[PDB]
Design a protein around this nucleic acid. Sequence first.
DNA 1: CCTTCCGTAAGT
DNA 2: CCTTCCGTAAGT
DNA 3: ACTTACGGAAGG
DNA 4: ACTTACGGAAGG
Lengths: 825, 831
Amino acid sequence: DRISWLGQPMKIEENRTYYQKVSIDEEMLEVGDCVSVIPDDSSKPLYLARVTALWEDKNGQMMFHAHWFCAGTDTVLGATSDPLELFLVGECENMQLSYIHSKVKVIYKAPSENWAMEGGTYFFQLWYNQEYARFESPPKTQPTEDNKHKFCLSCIRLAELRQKEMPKVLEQIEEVDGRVYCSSITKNGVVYRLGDSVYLPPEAFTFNIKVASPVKRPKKDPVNETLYPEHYRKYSDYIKGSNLDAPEPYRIGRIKEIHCGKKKGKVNEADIKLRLYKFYRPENTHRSYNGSYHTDINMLYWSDEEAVVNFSDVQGRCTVEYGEDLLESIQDYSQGGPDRFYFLEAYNSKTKNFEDPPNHARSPGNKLPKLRTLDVFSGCGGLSEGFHQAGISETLWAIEMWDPAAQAFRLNNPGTTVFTEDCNVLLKLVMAGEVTNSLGQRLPQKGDVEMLCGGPPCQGFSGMNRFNSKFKNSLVVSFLSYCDYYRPRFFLLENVRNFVSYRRSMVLKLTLRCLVRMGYQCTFGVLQAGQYGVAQTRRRAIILAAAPGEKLPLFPEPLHVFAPRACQLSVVVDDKKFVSNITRLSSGPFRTITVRDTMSDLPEIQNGASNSEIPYNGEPLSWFQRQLRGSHYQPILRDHICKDMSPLVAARMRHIPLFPGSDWRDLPNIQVRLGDGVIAHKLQYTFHDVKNGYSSTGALRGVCSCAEGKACDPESRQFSTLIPWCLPHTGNRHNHWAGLYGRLEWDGFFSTTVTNPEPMGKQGRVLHPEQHRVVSVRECARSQGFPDSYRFFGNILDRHRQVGNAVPPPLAKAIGLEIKLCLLS
Amino acid sequence: DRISWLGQPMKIEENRTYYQKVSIDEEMLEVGDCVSVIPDDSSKPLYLARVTALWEDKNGQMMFHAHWFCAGTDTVLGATSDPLELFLVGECENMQLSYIHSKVKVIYKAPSENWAMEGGEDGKTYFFQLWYNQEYARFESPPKTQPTEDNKHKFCLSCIRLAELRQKEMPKVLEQIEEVDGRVYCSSITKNGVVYRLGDSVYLPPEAFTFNIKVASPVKRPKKDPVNETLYPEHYRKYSDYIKGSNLDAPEPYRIGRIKEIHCGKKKGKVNEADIKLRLYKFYRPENTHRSYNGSYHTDINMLYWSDEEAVVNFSDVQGRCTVEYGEDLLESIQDYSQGGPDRFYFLEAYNSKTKNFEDPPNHARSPGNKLPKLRTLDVFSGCGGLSEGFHQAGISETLWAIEMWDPAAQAFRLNNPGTTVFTEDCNVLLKLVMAGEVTNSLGQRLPQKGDVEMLCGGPPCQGFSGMNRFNSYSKFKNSLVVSFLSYCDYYRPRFFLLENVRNFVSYRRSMVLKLTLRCLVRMGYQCTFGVLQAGQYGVAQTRRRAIILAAAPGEKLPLFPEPLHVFAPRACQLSVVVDDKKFVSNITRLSSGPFRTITVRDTMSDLPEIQNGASNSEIPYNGEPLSWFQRQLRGSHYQPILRDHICKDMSPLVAARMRHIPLFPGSDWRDLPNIQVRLGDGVIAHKLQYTFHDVKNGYSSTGALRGVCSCAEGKACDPESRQFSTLIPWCLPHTGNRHNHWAGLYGRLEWDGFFSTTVTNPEPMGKQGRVLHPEQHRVVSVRECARSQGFPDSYRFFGNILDRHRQVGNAVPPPLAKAIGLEIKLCLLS
DNA sequence: CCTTCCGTAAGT
DNA sequence: CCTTCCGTAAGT
DNA sequence: ACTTACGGAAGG
DNA sequence: ACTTACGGAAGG
Ligand SMILES: Nc1ncnc2c1ncn2[C@@H]1O[C@H](CSCC[C@H](N)C(=O)O)[C@@H](O)[C@H]1O
Ligand SMILES: Nc1ncnc2c1ncn2[C@@H]1O[C@H](CSCC[C@H](N)C(=O)O)[C@@H](O)[C@H]1O
Ligand SMILES: [Zn+2]
Ligand SMILES: [Zn+2]
Ligand SMILES: [Zn+2]
Ligand SMILES: [Zn+2]
């Protein structure tokens, strides 16, 4: 009703008079308390905030500053969240005291000094980021002196964010005829100087080298619908694993001069121009791709061509050095940091040759401790391998119930205690006070584990699972109980993409709630492994968590370009869209890793090879193979074996064309003489297909009675036919079974590597691009980014399962580097 | 931790010693307070309940009885609900005091004594106002029962509600007759609150028994002929074998029997009331005799035939009790007896199964001897008045005011209601006028004030919620008309409230509109509920699923949804509604069968004379008498020779030729059209359709001809100039057919044994709902046939041209459905 | 004008 | 054993 | 996979 | 409508 100020006013500025206490409707109010307000526009029935300022405007009305809270229902947690728990957000607003409904009490529940040893009114514990779905510890910033009257952490976070984001000129040179020339500018926290190199989108500029793109021949020959009676199912014109729509990598340029204009006497820093020396990627020269197969992905070519771009198109800064001015070798300089490129020659666009670059392209002169990591569901160790490639963790403990995976883990990690028992039983032993198991292996205790990582079985969450038991018993909750008992400093959970949408995202919301209740900072996101150095589509949901005293890491920024079809990392929970902190959407610094860079160096083998150790018949033929085979001399190639297929499947694979996109739909309807007097029968079409109609020859396109709208007729099932009967049987409602008995293409990439490559499975494009066989164990590990020195164990099926279940070491390394960034500062 | 009893225990029972107060962690707890409990299995993070008993078991454990609350998120409201608001439920259980987390504070928000005239710290505190029924989604006022000292130690409203429900639910033997050799004979039994006596009639499922008349089902139709794909190049799209508006899968109505003897068994010395047997005399519906359906077209839907056949059924299969009387024992006429109450059947003859004739029934079939005030109702979006007409057929309301911005609908409403003030202004403007204290508008029409409106009813525009609307992407629900209609309900605060819309109203915007309207009703203190009703189940031959939202004042009783009266096709009886993974259904108990047979197109259109396409004679005479019970209900018993509004739209010569080439067989539509050349009006010539493109989805025809008409059939982009004009087969139908279910029903015919699709505002054979062709005549349905499908009496008047009258008919609530709802509203006016 | 033309998605 | 067979629905 | 269904805008 | 993809059970 009536508003009356209490006490002496606080420091008054030009138009407002800050106060400390106030009385509304016989109540008392002080800065730091909380206030409820009734909404009129949002679907939410109530809003809660905290008072930070109590100024009185010169208009005569009484105002106050409210830093809003966020109910758990408004977060990604939703209805599962504790109704007494609130979260901090970067939302704040000025409002009159006439909208104050009541005064509520909100307390701060800080983690105990012995928080890591635990685990046997309204309140908030963490800050919530709505855009990235990030639960983080509240800032430690405090009101000092002058800001005590309007201290708003939301205003501070907002001012620092937009000031870091906006461009700013630091060092000016000279002003000539209305144009100011600069030498040092900055934006997004990045300092840009003259002589540095800069990432640009591919549409920033072109090259004087004319790239040719003539007509493609259209279906040069018509197809015989009697010989190939299932080709009409390829009308989609879509090729799985094709990099035709793959975007070009970042354009790189050399800043020579920076200039801009003026606005109202001062420099217009909002519109800064950059003039650059164009760099030539080996795929941009006259060689195009065909010459850039063996070259490094970070080797460029200097040019004296020039182009003018805007500073607003700058995506990032990269370090480009001349080859001979280096103080160390090329490999140590390339593997020493990110965004590092090098060049030894220069490219002339008109002469179409390679020279030595001028002297103005030359540069001036022209121990972190590893974390004790426990790896639950370690498998063969791909996740812990990537964590070791980041040099942030020694995996001391390992849990793996499957024996061959545990053996393969022991072969690659000699200093790891590998437990083969069940995770529930193993945790029950350490809860009972036991020191060692029956085998004498010491059990980790509280304080031993500094990081907990694992990838629970995704067979229940997989999109391919047909027969889709309760949460409190599912393995992901046992894996959470490990995090509750040991309370590590960092926590990582890996699963398939569909993990964030299983049962309307209930599993995700419950795992996040359990992390929030323990006091852990946490976040989630989806990452495509193909963006981090592998030639395979592998979207995986990652759940990160950090201790209250630590810093919550960010998600790794993509390093390689990839097909946009497989880069849909968005996640929708309860009508609210959430994305990771990734800022690179269109392009990236490095080109896409292809099948050619993944399998070209491996020798040619027949279907059913069993020699587990054969020699290399050549040297590495790409940067990817050079990274996996190492610089040391290693002539033995291990695990290059393919499954022995039946003569029927073998003949089917021999009749699959080598052209990209080919699959079972290109198979001919013929009879083939096999071993001895065995005969592969022909497929007979004796039923009408009401959906597909007749063919051009008038022949039918149905194989069963269900193609006529009737029920399935047993005894209509054909056996030992070249064209598999089951594929036209259920093809109409299964996307014509695209990819089955399909081939990879050299310029393309793998589909998601599974535990058993079979051409008649759901993901059935496992045929070699040239050879008449399925992919080998080594080719599967190559698609996963495993080093060739990595060992496996078991038979061919056991090793395939180890490769398929594993997290690609490139992706695990990308995550581990962002974890390393938190150990610093 | 430590739990200690406080004081002396009250009313101690055999194994339990009830207490009133207890101490947990040095705290105070007393019966009537509330308690927080941590869950272990549910996704919910917390549970809240109220302590009713605090006994100590003789086993040594300390127990207490918890009547659970229901968070607003756990209800149909979901995230929109007030986080401080709880609801009462019929959930209760015994539990140990070791699970008590903390003691919370819950207050009771009772409606104020001047509630009808409204509408113009300590952490967090909870409140409740209404009782929630999870199965039917019903918000009702809490019961007023109070504890007597004897029950004050374990007073649990959930246990009372469950005990009364299960006692009413269980079968019970009342009056037994004689016990003979282990079998007990009964004379009076009861269940579900229904009293059953010897000599009464009983509803049974169709599988209860058969008849001595053998109904045979000989051959299914053979393969008539291969289809000429050159003459009929669009027949291959009818492989679905589905006939729209077909009553082939329609279930049979209730079997009716006459209770003669009741017997059962024994269990543990007592009578086994759980297994009661009924032997009955079978009643013969006219469609069950040797006449079959074809002879039962003109007979009443409630006329039966007596028989001396016998059959033994179970008492657990009893669906309801019905009143069957012999024709001559009546004290009043047959029409006055049928229109006097529900479930009333009559019979004048008896049927002998072997002689196949009709006699006068024997003497053992004969019976013994052988001012409600109307509610002042405001009708927002009244249209032509179907909703208020159905409310008048229930005799529960005089519609005193009406709001209708469209002029022809308002005029037709005035024609059918002479004592209604019909406002043509906008509802927002009119409510803003009554908020400023103004009495009348510029026209001198008196505006209703607080206390004038006793019932508020309306159906806001459904074109935004209709499934046929393509460009449905305006937000700001708080300003959409449904909130304006809620603002009327907030201002006047009537005793009853009804909102009608399409079924998709409960799934629009991920069910946010429904949750927000229900939340707004809950905030006003209103009891409320929602449901989906099929109009075809209440006396019309039309599929018309409509979402209904009911609401009642706190001092009143929330009505139930009308129980289905007629059987209907199960394809269109999917009344379930799923919101936020939770399934909700109405209180309807009749799912399989019903008391009356289905109303068909024959019962709806057989008496209307034959007219040509484009008829304009607004008044033509009847060429005969009513030919069915339905027509006798709409035409009345009085002599009325003039048939009004039997006019058809004038189709273009092209469309007219298309309709002439539509076969009369059920399920036929545009896909049966021949690809021929037809001479039209004057020198116009209808060209043939040319297939010059490959259809990658449908392939080639049997003649090798193509099945594509545009480049998009090959996967390419649409090519203009490939569009053909003045063709008999419409080009746009094979153009976009693959992704529109082959445009089934377009240029389709109704069948006599079938029913209408949803009656729309403009019948066009090339629209989405395009089966508007007459079963025999080559024309679209008339205005009278549309009003017939909507259940409108033939005496009801319209206004405007043929399109204005069509739009009045389509937008209207079917009077049978509105009457079915109004009867359930009438049951609350009593007691 | 009006005759044609045609992104429901949500259920079931 | 291992070769065939096939209710994702959820997204975009 | 199919079936529902108080339609509206584009095209001459 | 159109593509996704740490598959599992029915069968020979
Ligand atoms: N109950 C259980 N206890 C221990 N290990 C289990 C288990 N259930 C399944 N596993 C094993 O956990 C493994 C997960 S595969 C994941 C491996 C790891 N993420 C990597 O990148 O290499 C499976 O191979 C399975 O054999
Ligand atoms: N803003 C508005 N104010 C008043 N009436 C409106 C309106 N918007 C639409 N209308 C009218 O509301 C009518 C709904 S038709 C519904 C009629 C009624 N349910 C019955 O059974 O007969 C439409 O004809 C339309 O003209
Ligand atoms: Zn602020
Ligand atoms: Zn079949
Ligand atoms: Zn109870
Ligand atoms: Zn087209």
